[PDB]
Scaffold this active site. Structure first.
Site, PDB file in Angstrom:
ATOM      1  N   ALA B  51       0.873  -1.168   0.000  1.00  0.00           N
ATOM      2  CA  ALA B  51       0.000   0.000   0.000  1.00  0.00           C
ATOM      3  C   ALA B  51       0.920   1.230   0.000  1.00  0.00           C
ATOM      4  O   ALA B  51       1.311   1.734   1.058  1.00  0.00           O
ATOM      5  CB  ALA B  51      -0.899  -0.021   1.207  1.00  0.00           C
ATOM      6  N   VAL B 141      -3.930  -4.333  -2.994  1.00  0.00           N
ATOM      7  CA  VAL B 141      -4.658  -3.704  -1.888  1.00  0.00           C
ATOM      8  C   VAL B 141      -5.953  -3.042  -2.386  1.00  0.00           C
ATOM      9  O   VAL B 141      -6.860  -2.874  -1.604  1.00  0.00           O
ATOM     10  CB  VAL B 141      -3.760  -2.642  -1.133  1.00  0.00           C
ATOM     11  CG1 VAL B 141      -3.517  -1.360  -2.010  1.00  0.00           C
ATOM     12  CG2 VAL B 141      -4.360  -2.237   0.272  1.00  0.00           C
ATOM     13  N   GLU B 232       4.263  -9.544 -13.335  1.00  0.00           N
ATOM     14  CA  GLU B 232       3.298 -10.508 -13.901  1.00  0.00           C
ATOM     15  C   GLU B 232       3.865 -11.314 -15.066  1.00  0.00           C
ATOM     16  O   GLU B 232       3.551 -12.510 -15.210  1.00  0.00           O
ATOM     17  CB  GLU B 232       1.969  -9.838 -14.224  1.00  0.00           C
ATOM     18  CG  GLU B 232       1.008 -10.663 -14.989  1.00  0.00           C
ATOM     19  CD  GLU B 232      -0.333  -9.956 -15.166  1.00  0.00           C
ATOM     20  OE1 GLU B 232      -1.072  -9.835 -14.156  1.00  0.00           O
ATOM     21  OE2 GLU B 232      -0.628  -9.506 -16.309  1.00  0.00           O
TER      22      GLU B 232
END
EC number: 2.4.1.40
Lengths: 274, 274
Positions: B51, B141, B232
């Site tokens: 975050a 988040v 990713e």
């Protein structure tokens, strides 16, 4: 080929249990992927078989067909438990494959014979097997392989769907039903009916399963009870409380003379000899 | 209820990969069985979340909804990585659940920010996480839980089907396609497209995955390349070569504003905040 997320691998059978263990059917696995995963670990599979008295006569076909169909490309160690070492046929084996004969003693009354498989696998799993193989597989000798049986079965602990019960409701399962027996399963409980003739898993899990069933059978004997289906009844109770991490479909344990070849079996891999 | 061997748990989706890893959909698992199996091991699950800067504003809903839906009945340790410790809201937690704030430093250029998740999970997985949790789960988040996410996801290593690609052929997957990148996957390869926003597994496997992706990203940086979808892209290459032992369906990572609620999702469990 790319897996298709929006197409079931099978439209006719259950392919995973409610505790997310794969149920192994043809069409559920890519053997090339599994072979590579297990080869990278240099996996050795022990295969145990009991051939007592007249059952010595089944060894030749059992071994010749295992050579063609069982764990081909992987390291295999056959362990033949027999009361007749000299009667074990000399079957020629592929590279990376070996056989040991383990001599079985007297027995010496019938409840002892009933406990021999669990007791002897338990004993040998704790000596020899633990330093020699990664997985142990226990099957019956009066059987032949007809089709591939490979690393798709390998997992910490597995049982096999009994060919007579896979379509049955749990009420029809021939579990031990007397509460006085260690193998007791109540009427309302049970996931599947597993067959005693094909189970296995990692050496540690097989160590645990056979010790448990042998210890439980000894308790039963002391209380003057024998489970309705002997070590199969205890195998079932064990796999009810310690759920297998894979289950084999009846492709892996069939009897074509008794049950034919229904459409739901795309392959008959390992079958009873008539 | 007794599992039904002759009825697919789903008639519309694939529920096991070709390497026999369960794909987790509603209707595939009995949570009562799984809860018991994991409770018997006193399982602790670490949940990591980044975050940074303005994303601090998503923490309150993220944590309040995790309290309602995430691993309820199990031990949970939240690990909040943030550049603003004081901005972490005080959310009241259920018994057996705790939160630690981990302060993130400067970054200090954008390829460093791109590598921060893999690098920091890798670093903390090797100190704190290994003595504190059994499984580690990494999510984003800017998300809320709407429905159950529990021990059904737990396994040595898992990824999640990206909600934009689960019906796509591999040609459409946005893998890194330049052979000069460590994340390179050729046109002919790929099982699934996994999303970077939800992966995990045992601490040891997550240690291995994050170290590998961080080491590979560092190689890419040195060669002046950044994978098309950053960590990713590397997650995908890793899970191509080290296949996950479960895959989560898109129930576990959805965006209802972008993608609606199609019939194939019986539950929307964890969704993007609009």
């Amino acid at each position: 080929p790319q897996p298709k997320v929006l197409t079931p691998s099978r439209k006719d059978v259950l392919v995973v249990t409610p505790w997310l263990a794969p149920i192994v059917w043809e069409g559920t696995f890519n053997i090339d992927i599994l072979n590579e995963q297990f080869r990278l670990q240099n996996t050795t599979i022990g295969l145990t078989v009991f051939a007592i008295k007249k059952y010595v006569a089944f060894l030749k076909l059992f071994l010749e067909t295992a050579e063609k169909h069982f764990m081909v490309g992987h390291r295999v160690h056959y362990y033949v438990f027999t009361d007749q070492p000299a009667a074990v046929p000399r079957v020629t084996l592929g590279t990376g494959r070996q056989l040991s004969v383990l001599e079985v003693g007297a027995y010496k009354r019938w409840q002892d014979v009933s406990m021999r498989r669990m007791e002897m696998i338990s004993d040998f799993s704790e000596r020899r097997f633990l330093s020699e193989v990664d997985y142990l597989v226990s099957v019956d000798v009066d059987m032949e392989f007809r089709d591939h049986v490979g690393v798709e079965i390998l997992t910490p602990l597995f049982g096999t769907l009994h060919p007579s019960f896979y379509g049955s409701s749990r009420e029809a399962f021939t579990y031990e039903r007397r509460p006085q027996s260690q193998a007791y399963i109540p009427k309302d409980e049970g996931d599947f009916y597993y067959m005693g003739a094909f189970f296995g898993g990692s050496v540690q899990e097989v160590q645990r399963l056979t010790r448990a069933c042998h210890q439980a059978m000894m308790v039963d004997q002391a209380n003057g009870i024998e489970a309705v289906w002997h070590d199969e009844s205890h195998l079932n109770k064990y796999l009810l409380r310690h759920k297998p991490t894979k289950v084999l479909s009846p492709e892996y344990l069939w009897d074509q003379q008794l049950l034919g070849w229904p459409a739901v079996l795309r392959k008959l891999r390992f079958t009873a000899v008539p």
